[PDB]
Design a protein around this ligand. Structure first.
Ligand SMILES: O=c1ccn([C@@H]2O[C@H](COP(=O)(O)OP(=O)(O)O[C@H]3O[C@H](CO)[C@@H](O)[C@H](O)[C@H]3O)[C@@H](O)[C@H]2O)c(=O)[nH]1
Length: 444
């Protein structure tokens, strides 16, 4: 007969998001923010000023913070941690005292920044840790943290058996020694994702349960992890060179283009670029090869963008960046020569594109193991077993993926996993359900 009703809805719930300022961490966070804004949430993405321009063009409320850094990996990272700890706390407190927006309910922060949980909890809001790597390699990091099995790795070969994982050869383990005297720092960075795993309010993984069933269930029983991937949309984020790349691809034959990208960070030696060049300029396919501006000088002196007719009569384009998700979904693309970063790997899965795996370090070695031997949607190159990958090896892997009956089955496998990733994020799918569990319980 008389009183007041209070309605908690997405439209009056405010979600803060803070990615690590690198594209493989920014991009999956942005995709997740877009899905959350689509459910009606007020979403504020926080990012460093030197990434603010990039994020501004791709896209949601946007907020910049100082880069926090002036310097090797450690000094860079400790300054970073100290600076963003204060600036994000300031943003949280300002949005508490505001009146236009709702006060923040939760901070979604990158899993490699676990101290951000103390920032969120210290300011009275929930924390959600977004893991940007698959379940299988993340569990390895946990076991390395637990200091149980010896992971130290030339007088023998070792094979490691961990619960709910296929046996892992030494080459299958996440690769840190590439970083030499910084291997400890990079190692610590990935291991420490688990330092406070039991105190995190939501543990988010950009993967889908059918892809990693055994290990996801294992993790789900230990922690209440929510697999919510792929966060990228199925068949928004507007990448640079979009019109140029789509026009070039629209003029190619179906299933005729090898797409080549080594991600946003990896840098191959100039001898390694030469092997890749000679392979691509003599194969029976067109090619689209992303060579970042800062990497152009490692190209063979033989050669913003550049067009080629190849020695096989085909066409090549070398470009400094591309809308990778749109490239992968283009009918012209036959396969994806990739460094096996997790976003690249999962984007290719969601697109049905088989892979040639040229992994460089951290999780890319483990991902390539799963791409070839578990999901069976690619072939991994063979290095002296850090070793150079020769043009004849790359050529062997192209002919296998694109010119053999085995390649036809890898393509069938990849269309099967493509359908499964689409079902995961559709209504009733495992990832849609876990993302809704996140959204719905935020309202409680
Ligand atoms: O021309 C290009 C090339 C790449 N991308 C995008 O850039 C991201 C690349 O990310 P990823 O494939 O994960 O590679 P990295 O840039 O190397 O990302 C780092 O962080 C990832 C997430 O933790 C790890 O999986 C990687 O191994 C690590 O190097 C993806 O969203 C791609 O779609 C583009 O949009 N255009």
């Amino acid at each position: 007969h008389m009183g007041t009703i209070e309605i908690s809805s997405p439209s009056k719930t405010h979600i803060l998001a803070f990615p690590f300022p690198e594209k493989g961490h920014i991009n999956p966070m942005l995709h997740l923010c877009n899905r959350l804004a689509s459910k009606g949430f007020r979403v504020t993405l926080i990012t460093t000023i030197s990434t603010y321009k990039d994020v501004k063009n791709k896209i949601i409320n946007l907020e910049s913070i100082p880069d926090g850094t002036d310097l090797g990996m450690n000094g860079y990272f400790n300054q970073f941690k100290n600076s963003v700890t204060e600036s994000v706390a300031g943003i949280i407190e300002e949005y508490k005292l505001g009146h236009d927006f709702p006060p923040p309910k939760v901070l979604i922060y990158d899993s490699t920044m676990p101290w951000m949980l103390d920032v969120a909890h210290g300011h009275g809001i929930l924390g959600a840790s977004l893991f940007t790597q698959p379940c299988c390699v993340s569990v390895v990091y946990y076991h390395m943290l637990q200091g149980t099995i010896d992971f130290h790795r030339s007088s023998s070969s070792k094979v490691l058996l961990l619960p709910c994982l296929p046996p892992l050869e030494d080459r299958d383990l996440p690769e840190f020694d590439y970083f030499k005297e910084d291997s400890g720092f990079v190692s610590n960075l990935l291991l420490n994702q688990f330092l406070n795993i039991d105190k995190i309010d939501y543990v988010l993984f950009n993967t889908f349960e059918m892809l990693e069933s055994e290990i996801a269930n294992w993790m789900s029983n230990k922690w209440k992890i929510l697999t919510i991937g792929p966060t990228a949309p199925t068949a928004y984020l507007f990448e640079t060179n979009t019109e140029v790349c789509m026009k070039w691809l629209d003029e190619r034959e179906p299933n005729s283009v090898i797409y080549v990208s080594f991600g946003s960070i990896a840098s191959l030696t100039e001898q390694q670029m030469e092997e890749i060049s000679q392979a691509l300029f003599t194969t029976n396919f067109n090619f689209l090869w992303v060579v970042r501006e800062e990497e152009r000088t490692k190209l063979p002196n033989c050669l913003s963008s550049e067009s080629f007719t190849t020695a096989a009569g085909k066409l090549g384009l070398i470009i400094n960046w591309c809308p990778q998700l749109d490239v992968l979904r283009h009918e012209s693309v036959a396969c994806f020569m990739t460094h096996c970063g997790w976003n690249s790997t999962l984007e290719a899965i969601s697109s049905g594109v088989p892979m040639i795996c040229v992994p460089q370090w951290v999780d890319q070695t483990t991902n390539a193991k799963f791409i070839q031997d578990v999901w069976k949607i690619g072939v991994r190159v063979n290095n002296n077993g850090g070793g150079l990958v020769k043009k004849e090896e790359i050529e062997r892997c192209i002919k296998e993926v694109c010119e053999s009956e085995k390649g036809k089955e890898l393509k069938r496998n990849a269309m099967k996993w493509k359908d499964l990733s689409k079902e995961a994020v559709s209504e009733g799918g495992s990832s849609d359900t876990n993302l809704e569990y996140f959204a719905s319980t935020l309202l409680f």
